[PDB]
Design a binder for this molecule. Structure first.
Ligand SMILES: Cc1cc2nc3c(=O)[nH]c(=O)nc-3n(C[C@H](O)[C@H](O)[C@H](O)COP(=O)(O)OP(=O)(O)OC[C@H]3O[C@@H](n4cnc5c(N)ncnc54)[C@H](O)[C@@H]3O)c2cc1C
Ligand SMILES: Cc1cc2nc3c(=O)[nH]c(=O)nc-3n(C[C@H](O)[C@H](O)[C@H](O)COP(=O)(O)OP(=O)(O)OC[C@H]3O[C@@H](n4cnc5c(N)ncnc54)[C@H](O)[C@@H]3O)c2cc1C
Lengths: 383, 380
């Protein structure tokens, strides 16, 4: 079977015991004392800068409005990825509506990009659940045969304007389908010459390093430089609840928060060693995570090597201390939702759980009981 | 029983079938409609001149100290030690200890004020059993019953209210069976503090109320009944869609929940001899309707309003006190850390951010006062 070894490794990791997943990640995430000392200084600076000085999550109601509101931050060195809000389509008519939303957005974003390309100019992010009715329930063969022509058509428009098109990561049980779709698109000759295809991998998932191995190898055999957004993950609370009801003895996600942090750093090390064939995009609002990757990546940098990413309404204060020659001189792409209350609910719940959780960096930075010492501590050394 | 059969039969009764009996009961006379429109306009005009926000204190001692100001203004309290959906035996044990310690503190603070003038407590059954939603009902009740009875006995000892909050629709039957056992338990005789929430967004609501009113009358317990719309609507919809069902256990149009609430309020106001109705709402039109439906006769203990801490103060400052409507309001007061706050806080966000919610529409420039005072019966 093609890629038998890489695919078997993903499947074997799906619900592997958490204690067995961690040792290789801890080793891969271990950095030198010299690097850890330098990163602690950077993280302290970022946090000292930070601790001083629903509509909040949405950039605009239409793509035209969102694009207009993006000019100020683009002038400062930020880029954008626009998300037409909407997911989990329940009818064919809803899936067709979302498809048309994305199509119209690509034309508008492509015009605004004006030839800036996939790294300096804006792109789009899509959710597969918006494009197939009952995405979570229908057999993969039926989902594939109807979804693939739709995603290909959107990818062709993005190619035509030379903008990025990212497939967002959703629930753990749709990782396999989405990855199979990524493979088919990356091997499709009609998309040749365009490196804008992107894909998210969630470091809270046990399969993350093995999915990355598959994607890096896919980049090598397809000739596409795949954009890879490394995230921790947005669905943790729902995944725990679903696994409990499913009767599982071992879950598809980690259950200790610092294990996700270690997983993220280990996976960043793998991505940073493969920048010839992937474009790593480090999505995080955690200043300690950011500092660790900034130092892991070393002194040599150019635009197009890698970037950081943040969510609209959450990451701007931190990344104002990152973008720009006087700061860390590293770019950041803002994930920019577009829509109204009618399409905001699912995304907003995930933001509430992210912002309100006692374990989240964005909560802890405002917690008087959490010292700066603890905020800059390297989680890898805790394990 | 016949009353319990009506509850089970209504579980997923088609929505269009549920409405005609509610529309009739929620229909008010023109004089009452006109008075309610006048009161509601006055309340809304005062309003339009106006997660730490949702927590009264980290501990029960802190929350009690902060309650003195509003208690002398005419408010009362129901304290909620945050916590729900226990996943382990250790978690359910910890929540039990929190509820137990809260009852001792609240009961000592009550100092003989009784169940209407003095503070009470609210509990969630899902906090007290480690597999509350995922285990067999008869077994869940058989382990939950001694725990809830022990808490009820403490509440009786101090003569305070103890309310069972309502949670997911698939747990209504279990919790109702628990209420019946407690109300027939001779060890709790002479105490009228047992309370129970019924959710008007549920199709079973009027039949649950019939069962509870009859249970109160035959048991001699003046059951405190908190009538709410409901806090879990988005979750019930998502579960019912995944379940492949065509008919859900909740209404799908917000106006139907509003009509259901008014119809159920009418049923409760006709039964104040045997139940203590507690009208929990932040909607000034809903409040004004119930205020006039209740009539001119009032005494402390007949009924009360209720609100959530951090949400209801602007409205109820126009209600409590002799310069206002002279009706009491009990504040639901969450107590706990940010850790235990998360699920409650999310529900507060689905409630406050929803375009259909009164608390959002009150600030929405596109929504007229004329629309806010519309009578749901006349709009459905
Ligand atoms: C631009 C951008 C795009 C994103 N796209 C996606 C996407 O397509 N799909 C997606 O799923 N996520 C996505 N995310 C990630 C998600 O939305 C959160 O923003 C992210 O997980 C928060 O991580 P952090 O490093 O900012 O914060 P931190 O506070 O460091 O980490 C918080 C994270 O830890 C994890 N976590 C919390 N508790 C536990 C626990 N007990 N055990 C194990 N893990 C735990 C969760 O992943 C949580 O979000 C994206 C994030 C950004 C910034
Ligand atoms: C003191 C207090 C205690 C409470 N205790 C509980 C409890 O134990 N259990 C519980 O479940 N709830 C409880 N609630 C209710 C819940 O938390 C909300 O506060 C309440 O439902 C809001 O109703 P309202 O009259 O203030 O607002 P409104 O804006 O008038 O009504 C909003 C409500 O309408 C309903 N709704 C919204 N959209 C739709 C729709 N499309 N179709 C059908 N219905 C819809 C929902 O129930 C929503 O909450 C309590 C409320 C208070 C004030």
């Amino acid at each position: 079977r093609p890629q038998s070894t890489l695919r078997r490794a993903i499947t074997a990791a799906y619900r592997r015991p958490e204690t067995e997943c961690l040792p290789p990640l801890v080793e891969a995430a271990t950095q030198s004392k010299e690097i850890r000392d330098a990163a602690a200084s950077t993280a302290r600076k970022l946090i000292e800068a930070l601790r001083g000085k629903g509509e909040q999550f949405v950039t605009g109601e239409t793509i035209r409005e969102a694009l207009k509101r993006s000019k100020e931050l683009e002038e400062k060195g930020f880029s954008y990825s626009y998300d037409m809000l909407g997911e989990a389509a329940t009818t064919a008519a809803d899936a067709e509506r979302y498809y048309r939303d994305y199509e119209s957005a690509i034309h508008a974003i492509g015009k605004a990009s004006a030839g800036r390309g996939i790294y300096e100019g804006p792109g789009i992010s899509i959710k597969l659940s918006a494009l197939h009715p009952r995405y979570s329930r229908a057999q993969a063969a039926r989902v594939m045969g109807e979804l693939l022509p739709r995603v290909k058509a959107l990818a062709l428009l993005a190619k035509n304007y030379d903008i990025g098109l990212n497939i967002d990561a959703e629930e753990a049980d749709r990782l396999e389908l989405s990855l199979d779709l990524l493979e088919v698109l990356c091997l499709d000759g009609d998309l040749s010459g365009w490196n804008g295809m992107g894909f998210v991998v969630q470091a809270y998932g046990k399969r993350c390093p093995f999915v990355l191995d598959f994607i890096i190898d896919l980049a090598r055999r397809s000739g596409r430089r795949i954009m890879v957004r490394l995230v921790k993950g947005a669905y943790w609370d729902a995944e725990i609840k679903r696994a409990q009801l499913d009767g599982l003895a071992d879950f598809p996600v980690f259950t200790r928060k610092i294990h996700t942090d270690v997983s993220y750093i280990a996976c960043a090390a793998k991505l940073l060693a493969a920048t010839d064939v992937v474009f790593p995009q480090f999505a995080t609002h955690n200043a300690q995570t950011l500092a660790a990757i900034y130092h892991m990546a070393g002194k040599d940098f150019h635009v197009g090597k890698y970037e950081f990413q943040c969510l609209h309404g959450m990451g701007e204060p931190l990344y104002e201390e990152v973008v720009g020659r006087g700061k860390l001189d590293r770019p950041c792409r803002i994930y920019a939702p577009v829509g109204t209350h009618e399409t905001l609910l699912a995304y907003l719940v995930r933001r509430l759980l992210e912002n309100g959780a006692n374990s989240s960096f964005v909560h802890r930075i405002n917690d008087p009981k959490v010292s700066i010492d603890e905020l800059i501590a390297d989680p890898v050394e805790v394990v």
